[PDB]
């Protein structure tokens, strides 16, 4: 049933949050998953709300794979948790624990955490832009049916419960694939920096402890 897989479906259900990131190149409008990745989303939805990810570049671009931003330090050594030097229930210094669920997956579109290993998530994210067929590639056996289709339209299935995914691309995937361009010969285009504007939060959540 394709219903129990959140990211199949582009309406936001009723414990999914919504946000409209606004970039250099357009508007990217994702909803989150605070059912599956409940620190994920508040860690997120949170360091938004703030303006921490204001004026941030994407510092890195690769076609056909993702797009990461979240790096105060510009280059994917920096960024924090908004736990780290607060709650080391949530965060012992290093960051928060991975979210691993049998109902998300790197496909197209899907927002994840990055990481420097398992359970130091901080505040880099990344969108998987990949347009490859990937279906045929897959371990049937060990994906949900939903999800082997899914697949066909791309993705990155080697991520897959390695690194948590808390959301999804429901509206200017355009974009997604319009930054992820500038990787294309690269060597004949003009130098650009692909920066947030603005994380606009449409369909807040919140978490109680």
Same mark, same amino acid.
């Given at each position: 049933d394709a219903s129990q897989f959140p990211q199949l479906t582009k309406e936001v259900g009723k414990e999914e949050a919504k946000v409209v990131m606004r970039?250099?190149?357009?508007?990217?409008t994702l909803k989150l998953f605070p059912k599956y990745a409940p620190l994920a989303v508040e860690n997120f939805l949170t360091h938004a709300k703030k303006g921490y990810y204001d004026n941030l570049t994407?510092?890195?671009?690769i076609n056909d794979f993702m797009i990461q931003s979240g790096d105060p330090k510009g280059d994917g050594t920096g960024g924090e948790s908004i736990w780290k030097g607060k709650d080391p229930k949530k965060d012992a210094g290093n960051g928060f624990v991975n979210e691993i669920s049998p109902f998300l997956y790197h496909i197209r579109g899907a927002l994840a955490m990055a990481?420097?290993?398992? %359970?130091?998530?901080?505040? $880099?994210?990344y969108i998987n832009q990949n347009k490859k067929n990937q279906s045929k590639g897959l371990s049937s056996t060990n994906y949900p049916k939903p999800i082997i289709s899914a697949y066909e339209h791309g993705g990155n299935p080697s991520l897959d419960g390695g690194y948590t995914v808390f959301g999804q691309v429901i509206d200017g995937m355009d974009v997604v694939d319009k930054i992820a361009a500038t990787s294309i010969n690269q %060597?004949?285009?003009?130098? $650009?920096?692909?920066?947030?504007?603005s994380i606009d939060i449409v369909?807040?959540?919140?978490?109680?402890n």
């Open positions: 970039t250099s190149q357009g508007d990217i994407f510092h890195r671009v990481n420097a290993g398992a %359970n130091t998530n901080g505040s $880099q994210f %060597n004949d285009k003009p130098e $650009q920096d692909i920066t947030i504007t369909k807040d959540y919140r978490f109680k």
